[PDB]
């Protein structure tokens, strides 16, 4: 094939061009995004039961839905919580690879059939089914700076004038309003109601009657009396549109003819659907839009389009309204892309310089400068073919690939140049002969490196999704690189390289190059002398090899293993948890203190604090909140002290001084879409109808036993809420019947007043919105207020609640959890320092085995993945080793000689581990993929040394040592060339600070360390390997 194309340079060019066109087109059309989809598909069912406690939600909604979740394909597990805000969320997680659209539709269709089994009030609110994704592209904040708009006002403005246009913007997949549009609020007064002998029941009836859409018919409708001239629709009552109209709803006409209107027993206003969230941005009222990226879309273009659309809207804003951007992931995407392009260009420059330094002709430097871009463009086409996107992982794949593409180009050119100098052949004949010497090895190498990189693609779950990005990118690149080296570069070599006279090694040149050539010829002699001495004493080098292998093993086990590094993402969170029964007002006090800290103590680093009262992740309620903190640009935050790690540490330290509240800061996970990946995620399960109290006791038993093993388990805690005081009110049925008061009136009166009731819809400036009746706040705060509510008996007498009820305090759960249909408690925790997550899991299991009868357990989230996903790695490495061996056996026609190549693996790994340990980095994905690259490149160098030595033995009849020495002499230059080019090329990654530098450092450090030792050690050790192995067999 090289010979084919050496005589057909045009055909070779044609192939190169086709590849470049394909690649160019692929660059234009490929989606861009930060990360590919990594999390297994999840669908969430969300429902709301206004005024309901957690147990009510569970026992009338959650259980009913769960029991109907059958006959849905590829379901891994289902979890749910039911809480005292009236909310249920059921999350169904599916096998990786499940089509999420099908998963969603299957879930939705089972839900639709369960709807008739749910309470009326839940059917009326409706139940939502969404794909679950904390992968927002960005969050757009909307605030009012001039004190003229409440959060409800803002949220309505956004719903009515902004959201829909954002939703229609190119590349926008989904948009969440952080707030609600207006609702018609009827705030009832029990004093006024009683004065006119009315109840919330009368109010609700009146609203349903007087705020409705009534069907009529037609004049002159079919079938008509013939001769009819006119056909027209008859329009009857339509929905109310204003507070004024709601105010005049007629409740009653008194005997003396006076009228009781709704405004006479209630305050009427446009207010929120819900009052549980208070959202502030730097202290001012805030709403916002959470925006997700459409499948296939360009993230950067979408962000730009979103900005352009907002700009068009600004001229129509009310006074004081301002857009802010408290969270945007596209800076990372932008910077990541820029950094990879810069790297690629630098690589080409560095290769050019190295080529020129050694080969000292410009024609030779052009050959790699063409070939590398050809391979890269081709690689993009292959990504597009298999449906991958341009993202962080695929782009780092290409950065890691560079050293292999560069090598193939160097190897071909360098080898021709050597043949011309040693033998005096003209360019074309030299190329033919040179390609003869390497083409088989290049093919062997392609098999070896496929064996090194392909197995990674076959991991499962989220980890497999990550690994697969690197694996497909690198393997594609590498395969294209070999094709180019068999097709294009030989053709270019034969037609571009100038002749070299036999013996001319440039020593007779003048100036720098003259000196360099004399220096390098002499350095080769020193090198070959050294190897000669090594080969007279191979015993002590086998001892040094063993020390390296042991040392490698040592460093490896002690290197901490996180899967992705933490980044300063320009944002982080502060959690606020107050004692049980604490109010919104108190939580707000704390959130103000938190916001104050960041705006005063961290003024140089914090851009904004978005504080959300009433929301947390382990449960909602008045006594919880979060602050999202968004930082100034990395550029304006120089030094480690101004990075998220330091900031969160200082913040957390400071907030420990806060009294009667748990307050602390924590960074985001690297991939927000799969949440925290450190730790275990355990589920404790009631398997025998034990119940809530018995399950809590068993939880405490396990947590108490876990605390007795701090050498194995750390931070073992519930991911839930504790039981809190609740007000149990018992309706006395006998007394009610005796007084002639119906249970339905009692319960409606209680629920409507204290819990609120969704009555029906109305039309506010052309948008359908809800109507809520509820007590005015001052009449639904305390136990004594219960008795101020009156219910009308059949005989017309007004009866106070006190007459037919009794009350007591008790404890109950504000958030009940379930896992696979059974009551559960989620328990988080981690392995103690220096222990594996495995051993921690194992111990948790032993502890759990000793719990009361009827209490089971299970692993979920990342623990579930690990337990399935983690038993496959050994098999994959084993297959990989076997295939490498077999390819080398085919290449060398020997079962023994492959061992001389494979022994090289530790030489690069040790350097990577040294560099990582010294810089205090982790065994993360970027480090692993970098190891594989280092191993591949060092294997490639070894293969070519061994091939040349074996060839000299077989073809020219040379002795073992003579051939080994000639081999290493010939291969020294290309190895130093590739190594110097690559090590310098990765330097920028190593020293990188600021945005994305966590990743850049992980990639670059392992590779730089690896390449130093792979280079320095291999040039001495591979000859040893070959000679020892050949002697042994």
């Amino acid at each position: 094939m090289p010979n084919f194309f050496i005589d057909r340079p045009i055909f070779a060019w044609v192939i190169a061009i086709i590849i470049m066109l394909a690649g160019g087109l692929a660059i234009l059309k490929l989606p861009v995004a930060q990360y590919p989809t990594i999390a297994p598909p999840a669908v969430t069912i969300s429902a709301s039961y206004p005024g309901a406690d957690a147990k009510t939600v569970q026992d009338t909604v959650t259980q009913v839905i769960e029991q109907n979740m059958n006959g849905i394909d590829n379901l891994m597990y289902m979890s749910s919580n039911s809480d005292s805000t009236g909310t249920v969320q059921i999350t169904l997680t599916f096998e990786s690879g499940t089509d999420a659209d099908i998963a969603q539709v299957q879930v939705q269709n089972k839900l639709q059939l369960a709807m008739p089994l749910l309470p009326q009030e839940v059917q009326q609110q409706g139940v939502s089914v969404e794909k679950s994704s904390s992968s927002f592209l960005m969050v757009v904040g909307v605030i009012n700076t001039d004190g003229t708009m409440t959060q409800e006002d803002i949220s309505d403005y956004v719903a009515a004038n902004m959201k829909d246009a954002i939703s229609r913007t190119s590349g926008v997949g989904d948009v969440q309003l952080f707030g609600s549009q207006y609702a018609m609020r009827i705030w009832m007064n029990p004093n006024e109601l009683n004065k006119f002998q009315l109840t919330p029941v009368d109010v609700i009836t009146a609203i349903k009657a007087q705020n409705a859409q009534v069907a009529a018919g037609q004049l002159g409708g079919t079938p008509p009396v013939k001769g009819q001239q006119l056909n027209a629709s008859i329009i009857a009552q339509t929905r109310l549109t204003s507070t004024e109209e709601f105010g005049k709803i007629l409740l009653k006409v008194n005997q003396d003819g006076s009228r009781v209107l709704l405004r006479d027993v209630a305050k009427i206003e446009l207010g929120g659907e819900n009052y549980d969230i208070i959202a502030e941005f730097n202290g001012q009222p805030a709403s916002g839009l959470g925006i997700k990226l459409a499948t296939g879309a360009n993230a950067l273009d979408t962000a730009a389009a979103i900005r352009a659309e907002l700009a068009k809207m600004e001229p129509f804003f009310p006074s004081g309204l301002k857009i802010v951007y408290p969270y945007d992931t596209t800076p990372f995407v932008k910077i990541s892309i820029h950094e990879v392009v810069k790297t690629l260009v630098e690589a080409i420059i560095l290769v050019f310089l190295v080529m020129y330094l050694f080969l000292q002709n410009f024609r030779a430097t052009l050959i790699p400068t063409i070939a590398v871009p050809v391979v890269l463009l081709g690689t993009f086409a292959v990504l597009a073919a298999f449906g991958f996107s341009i993202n962080t992982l695929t782009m780092f794949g290409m950065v890691l690939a560079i050293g292999l593409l560069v090598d193939d180009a160097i190897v071909v050119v360098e080898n021709v140049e050597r043949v011309m100098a040693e033998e005096g052949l003209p360019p074309k004949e030299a190329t033919r002969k040179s390609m003869g010497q390497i083409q088989g090895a290049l093919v062997g190498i392609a098999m070896v490196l496929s064996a090194v990189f392909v197995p990674m693609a076959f991991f499962g779950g989220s980890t497999g999704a990550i690994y697969r990005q690197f694996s497909i990118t690198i393997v594609s690149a590498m395969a294209l690189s070999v094709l180019v080296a068999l097709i294009l570069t030989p053709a270019l070599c034969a037609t571009m390289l100038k002749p070299i006279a036999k013996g001319d090694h440039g020593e007779g040149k003048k100036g720098f190059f003259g000196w360099f050539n004399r220096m390098f010829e002499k350095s080769t002699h020193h090198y070959t002398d050294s190897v000669g001495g090594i080969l007279r004493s191979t015993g002590r080098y086998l001892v040094l090899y063993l020390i390296i292998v042991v040392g490698m093993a040592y460093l490896f086990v002690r290197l901490p293993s996180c899967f992705l590094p933490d980044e300063d993402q320009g944002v982080f969170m502060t959690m606020v948890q107050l004692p049980a029964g604490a109010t919104q007002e108190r939580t707000q006090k704390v959130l103000n203190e938190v916001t104050h800290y960041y705006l005063t103590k961290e003024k140089n680093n914090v851009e904004s604090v978005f504080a959300v009262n009433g929301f947390g992740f382990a449960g909602r309620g008045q006594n919880t909140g979060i602050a999202f903190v968004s930082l100034k640009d990395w550029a304006d935050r120089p030094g480690e002290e101004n990075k998220v790690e330091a900031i969160t540490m200082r913040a957390t330290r400071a907030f420990s001084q806060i009294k009667d509240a748990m307050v602390f800061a924590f960074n985001l996970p690297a991939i927000v879409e799969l949440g925290t990946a450190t730790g275990f995620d355990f589920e404790l399960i009631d398997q025998a109808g034990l119940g809530h109290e018995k399950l809590t006791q068993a939880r405490n038993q396990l947590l108490a036993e876990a605390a007795k093993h701090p050498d194995m388990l750390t931070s073992v805690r519930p991911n839930g809420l504790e039981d809190t005081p609740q007000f149990k009110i018992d309706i006395d049925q006998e007394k009610a019947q005796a007084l002639g008061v119906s249970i339905n009136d009692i319960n409606t009166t209680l629920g409507a007043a204290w819990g609120g009731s969704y009555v029906n819809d109305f039309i506010d400036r052309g948008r359908v919105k809800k109507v809520y009746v509820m007590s005015e706040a001052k009449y639904r705060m305390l136990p004594d207020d219960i008795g101020d509510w009156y219910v009308r008996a059949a005989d017309g007498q007004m009866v106070p609640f006190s007459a037919f009820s009794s009350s007591r305090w008790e404890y109950g759960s504000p958030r009940l959890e379930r896992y696979n249909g059974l009551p559960s408690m989620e328990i988080l925790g981690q392995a103690a320092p220096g222990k594996s997550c495995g051993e921690a899991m194992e111990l948790m299991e032993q502890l759990a085995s000793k719990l009361p009868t009827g209490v089971g357990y299970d692993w979920t989230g990342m623990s579930y993945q690990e337990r399935l996903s983690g038993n496959q790695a050994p098999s994959l490495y084993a297959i990989s080793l076997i295939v490498v061996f077999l390819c080398l056996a085919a290449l060398y026609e020997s079962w023994s000689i492959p061992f001389s190549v494979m022994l090289v693996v530790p030489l690069g790994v040790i350097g990577a581990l040294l560099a990582a340990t010294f810089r205090g980095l982790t065994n993360d994905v970027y480090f692993q993929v970098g190891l594989l690259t280092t191993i591949g490149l060092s294997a490639k160098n070894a293969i070519l040394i061994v091939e040349f030595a074996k060839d000299l033995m077989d073809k020219e009849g040379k002795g073992l040592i003579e051939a080994t020495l000639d081999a290493v002499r010939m291969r020294l230059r290309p190895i130093l060339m590739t190594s110097l080019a690559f090590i310098l090329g990765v330097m920028p990654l190593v020293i990188s600070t600021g945005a994305g530098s966590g990743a850049q450092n992980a990639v670059g450090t392992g590779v730089m360390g690896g390449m130093v030792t792979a280079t320095v050690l291999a040039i001495f050790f591979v000859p040893v390997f070959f000679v020892v192995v050949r002697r042994r067999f």
Binding site: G581, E734, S806, R808, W809
Partner: protein, 155 residues
Amino acid sequence: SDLGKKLLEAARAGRDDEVRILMANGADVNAADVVGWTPLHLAAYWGHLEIVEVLLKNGADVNAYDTLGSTPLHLAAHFGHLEIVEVLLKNGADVNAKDDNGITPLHLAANRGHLEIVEVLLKYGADVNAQDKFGKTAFDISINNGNEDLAEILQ
């Protein structure tokens, strides 16, 4: 109170050794949460006997009442905690304490059918004829609930 709160939490949790240290350090035994529960209330509700005893030794109000007039004896009786019922009574608990609804420990024990507790309450002078706000006695409760054994005890 810093230590009062800690004591409320520890009494509820049944953390025996933590209650001891708190007693050594003068944590307020008459601390009350927002609904008027004392540590003694908490320990009585959740059935923590040793903690009840410790609190009584350290001058807990045995007849503390909550914001609706309920006492530790009410809670211990209602939730079937015989030993605690006995300890409370030994320490002068008002066996006829009425909450704001006119409900007594006897009413509560009767309602849940706690036979042994009813006998103990009776033994310490529980008024068998005491009526709640609806005019109901423990006997009335037993009948409505169809507890024959409890009805026979209450003649």
